[PDB]
Design a protein around this ligand. Structure first.
Ligand code: MG
Ligand code: MG
Ligand code: MG
Ligand code: MG
Ligand code: MG
Ligand code: MG
Ligand code: MG
Ligand code: MG
Ligand code: MG
Ligand code: MG
Ligand code: MG
Ligand code: MG
Ligand code: MG
Ligand code: MG
Ligand code: MG
Ligand code: MG
Ligand code: MG
Ligand code: MG
Ligand code: MG
Ligand code: MG
Ligand code: MG
Ligand code: MG
Ligand code: MG
Ligand code: MG
Ligand code: MG
Ligand code: MG
Ligand code: MG
Ligand code: MG
Ligand code: MG
Ligand code: MG
Ligand code: MG
Ligand code: MG
Ligand code: MG
Ligand code: MG
Ligand code: MG
Ligand code: MG
Ligand code: MG
Ligand code: MG
Ligand code: MG
Ligand code: MG
Ligand code: MG
Ligand code: MG
Ligand code: MG
Ligand code: MG
Ligand code: MG
Ligand code: MG
Ligand code: MG
Ligand code: MG
Ligand code: MG
Ligand code: MG
Ligand code: MG
Ligand code: MG
Ligand code: MG
Ligand code: MG
Ligand code: MG
Ligand code: MG
Ligand code: MG
Ligand code: MG
Ligand code: MG
Ligand code: MG
Ligand code: MG
Ligand code: MG
Ligand code: MG
Ligand code: MG
Ligand code: MG
Ligand code: MG
Ligand code: MG
Lengths: 204, 137, 159
RNA sequence: CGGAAGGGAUAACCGCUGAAAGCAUCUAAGCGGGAAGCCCGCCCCAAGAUGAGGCCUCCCACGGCGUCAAGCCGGUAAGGAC
RNA sequence: GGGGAGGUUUGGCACCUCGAUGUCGGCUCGUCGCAUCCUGGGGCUGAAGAAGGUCCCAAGGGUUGGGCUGUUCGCCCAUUAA
RNA sequence: CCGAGCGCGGGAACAACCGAGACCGCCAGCUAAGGCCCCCAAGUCUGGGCUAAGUGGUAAAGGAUGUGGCGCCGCGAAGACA
């Protein structure tokens, strides 16, 4: 089980042999391991990677007290990668040889208050033969006297997007350690500049 | 004019578990959660002893209850009905099966729910050795 | 019942011998009793339930003895053209039309022999293991009821 | 890019050992195998889990009335808000 | 010839509603039942094989697009694992 | 009997089923139906059986080496049943 934090830098496509391939570029900058979860102290196993250089300004917080007990330059962000304990130092793109497959996590773009048709991709009524005030409406939502109420979790319009979205089995198309870069199969949740964690797949 | 007790004092108690018939034992436990044995019984105050059970992971039960008896559990959603059999309760959370009984034997109101909190069930023992603990039977 | 090394317990019964040791758990509401040349067995009542348990244990323990005594072992024929077998070290590997050659794990405390591509002896102390594992092999390719192919025990051909 | 893999327990069903019932029986003690189904595994929510959990780190005494009871009034610390 | 289950049809009865419980079909959105159409697992077969037939287990998901008619239903065209 | 006793107790809840005809007060007693393991008052009462299905916890023709019990006929140490 590997792990590493990064940002979605953007995406384009490169050529593998005589075939074009769409790839998303992820900057998985050097992550200074900050703490360690252990069965004795924490009840489980994991590692708290930091990421991105923080100015000692916003660090007014006693976060410095956490960084001191690890002697680390203060970072802007830090999340755990479950069940992964690297040697005491720092993780980097080095753990990702090309051809490996990864599970990428990211916060999707936020589609605000979304209609049922965009959210749940409903059908909605006819543009034409009558009705003309329910074109994008969800129509019926229930029955009659029984059950005489609406189901829990019924599909309805609402806020949708900007949620924890994890894609899986993406191919590591490349890896540029000279830049802490990491090329993938393109489709990765969230917008550019968005934090995103990359892990080892569960294909095998 | 009938007597009315004052601020009592929590008598604690320690019950075994092994070999005890689930329901049979569960009865006694309940009657202890309420007063009912303390002659200054007061149905609106709660002063029944604190109970602490241990080795609940060993409870006996007749018939084929271990496979027959299944606990249902409804979630709000459609089809949300879960059917967990006794065998699986003990196999996983076993203190659970003792609770689903005594709780089901306590009164229904707000006080009843307080009483449930006066119950401490473990699979062990090795319960937190606070203070009182007069083992019983 | 000679060859014994039997020993009683709060519920089970040990039976050592030239072959090995085998704990043969038996009903607790039953008297084993150990003579000197043979082991007896006693049931407390003549109720319907006790009858069944008496005879069962009366055999379990008998086989426990005859197990560490002479031991048990089953035979297995392999008819049909291409169908044949051989012994890869401890493990058996047989081919029977399947594109995949069947490798076979030798369970804990059992060993089988193949004195021929057609003959297959399953030698072991634990009668239970012998009976079960023996069948397991036959299951890998039961006999055709339209020919004379596959594994057999040593009984009439299904015609 | 996904439906899985895999682990575990099972349905019909197929068996080992095996009495009651000198034989016979998959069963009554006991055991093995066996489904797109069941329980896990994957993804998402989630401690108002009032049973409100855990870890790392940071700031700590009263400064006036309430003697008893817990509080109560102003100035501040880490820190937060406008 | 005989015994039942179900409450989808047609009825029987006239029990709530006539100081009002809007009737068919379609559309939209579904969810549940299993007496299973498909896929998964089985027993028998008058099962050589491939393909079927019959009963058993099994809802987890799936269950197409058109012609005709307001149609439900049904016929038809072209497909389908269905 | 309800209607007019939708007043009281039992029956989970429930006009007419079981108990019983409410003049008023009581922090006194005996009972009725029904009950006496916990929610819930009162026996985890006593003695003798039966039932292993959760039967009890609400279904038929019909089917079966379920289990316990009385009776009758026959075989048997002159040797049966398997
Ligand atoms: Mg449209
Ligand atoms: Mg109009
Ligand atoms: Mg309008
Ligand atoms: Mg309702
Ligand atoms: Mg309602
Ligand atoms: Mg950009
Ligand atoms: Mg049942
Ligand atoms: Mg109240
Ligand atoms: Mg109330
Ligand atoms: Mg699996
Ligand atoms: Mg696994
Ligand atoms: Mg089964
Ligand atoms: Mg047999
Ligand atoms: Mg058994
Ligand atoms: Mg069994
Ligand atoms: Mg298995
Ligand atoms: Mg499976
Ligand atoms: Mg599948
Ligand atoms: Mg599990
Ligand atoms: Mg579980
Ligand atoms: Mg959230
Ligand atoms: Mg979360
Ligand atoms: Mg909290
Ligand atoms: Mg949380
Ligand atoms: Mg907390
Ligand atoms: Mg802590
Ligand atoms: Mg001070
Ligand atoms: Mg001072
Ligand atoms: Mg009839
Ligand atoms: Mg109807
Ligand atoms: Mg009708
Ligand atoms: Mg009427
Ligand atoms: Mg009339
Ligand atoms: Mg009205
Ligand atoms: Mg109206
Ligand atoms: Mg209409
Ligand atoms: Mg309609
Ligand atoms: Mg099939
Ligand atoms: Mg065929
Ligand atoms: Mg043929
Ligand atoms: Mg033929
Ligand atoms: Mg033919
Ligand atoms: Mg074929
Ligand atoms: Mg059957
Ligand atoms: Mg079925
Ligand atoms: Mg069509
Ligand atoms: Mg056609
Ligand atoms: Mg086809
Ligand atoms: Mg067809
Ligand atoms: Mg009138
Ligand atoms: Mg009258
Ligand atoms: Mg009423
Ligand atoms: Mg009444
Ligand atoms: Mg009640
Ligand atoms: Mg009534
Ligand atoms: Mg009433
Ligand atoms: Mg009345
Ligand atoms: Mg009477
Ligand atoms: Mg009662
Ligand atoms: Mg019936
Ligand atoms: Mg009847
Ligand atoms: Mg009946
Ligand atoms: Mg009958
Ligand atoms: Mg029959
Ligand atoms: Mg005769
Ligand atoms: Mg004579
Ligand atoms: Mg016979």
């Amino acid at each position: 089980m590997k792990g590493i934090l990064g940002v979605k830098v953007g995406m384009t496509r490169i050529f593998r042999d005589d075939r074009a391939v769409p790839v998303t570029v992820i900057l998985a900058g050097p992550c200074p391991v900050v703490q360690r979860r252990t069965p004795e102290k924490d009840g489980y196993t994991a590692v708290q990677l930091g990421f991105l250089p923080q100015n000692p300004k916003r660090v007014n917080r006693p976060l410095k007290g956490h960084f001191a007990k690890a002697g680390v330059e203060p970072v802007r962000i830090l999340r755990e990668i479950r069940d992964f304990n690297p040697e005491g130092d720092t993780v980097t793109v080095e753990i990702f040889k090309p051809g490996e497959r990864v599970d990428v996590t990211g916060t999707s773009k936020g589609r605000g208050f979304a209609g049922v048709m965009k959210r749940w991709n409903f059908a909605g009524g006819p543009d034409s033969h009558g009705a003309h005030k329910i074109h994008r409406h969800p129509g019926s939502i229930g029955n009659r006297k029984t059950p005489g109420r609406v189901y829990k979790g019924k599909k309805m319009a609402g806020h949708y997007g900007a949620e924890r979205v994890t894609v899986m089995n993406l191919e590591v198309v490349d890896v540029i350690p000279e830049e802490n870069l990491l090329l993938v199969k393109g489709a990765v949740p969230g917008p550019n500049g968005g934090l995103v964690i990359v892990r080892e797949t569960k294909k095998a | 004019k009938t007597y009315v007790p004052k601020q009592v004092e929590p008598r604690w108690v320690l019950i075994d578990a092994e070999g005890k018939t689930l329901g049979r034992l569960a009865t006694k436990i309940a009657t202890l959660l309420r007063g009912k044995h303390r002659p200054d019984w007061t149905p609106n105050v709660a002063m029944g002893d604190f109970v602490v059970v241990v080795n609940a992971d060993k409870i006996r039960v007749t018939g084929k209850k271990l496979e027959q008896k299944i606990y249902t559990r409804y979630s709000g959603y459609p089809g949300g009905l879960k059917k967990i059999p006794l065998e699986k309760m003990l196999a996983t959370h076993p203190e659970r099966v003792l609770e689903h009984a005594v709780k089901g034997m306590l009164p229904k109101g707000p006080l009843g729910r307080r009483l449930f909190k006066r119950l401490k069930v473990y699979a062990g023992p090795d319960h937190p050795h606070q203070a009182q603990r007069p083992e019983k039977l | 019942p000679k060859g014994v090394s039997v020993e009683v317990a709060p519920g089970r019964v040990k039976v050592k011998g030239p072959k090995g040791e085998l704990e043969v758990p038996v009903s607790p509401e039953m008297r084993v009793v150990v003579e000197e040349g043979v082991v007896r067995v006693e049931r407390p009542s003549d109720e319907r339930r006790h009858k069944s348990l008496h005879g069962l244990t009366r055999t379990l323990i008998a086989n426990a003895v005859k197990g560490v005594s002479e031991g048990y072992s089953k035979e297995l024929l392999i008819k049909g053209i291409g169908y044949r077998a051989r012994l890869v070290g401890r493990a058996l590997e047989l081919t029977v039309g399947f594109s995949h050659p069947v490798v076979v794990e030798p369970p804990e405390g059992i060993t089988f022999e193949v004195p021929e591509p057609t003959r297959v002896r399953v030698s072991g102390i634990d009668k239970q293991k012998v009976g079960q594992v023996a069948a397991n092999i036959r299951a890998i390719r039961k006999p055709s009821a339209y020919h004379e192919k596959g594994i057999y025990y040593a009984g009439e051909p299904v015609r």
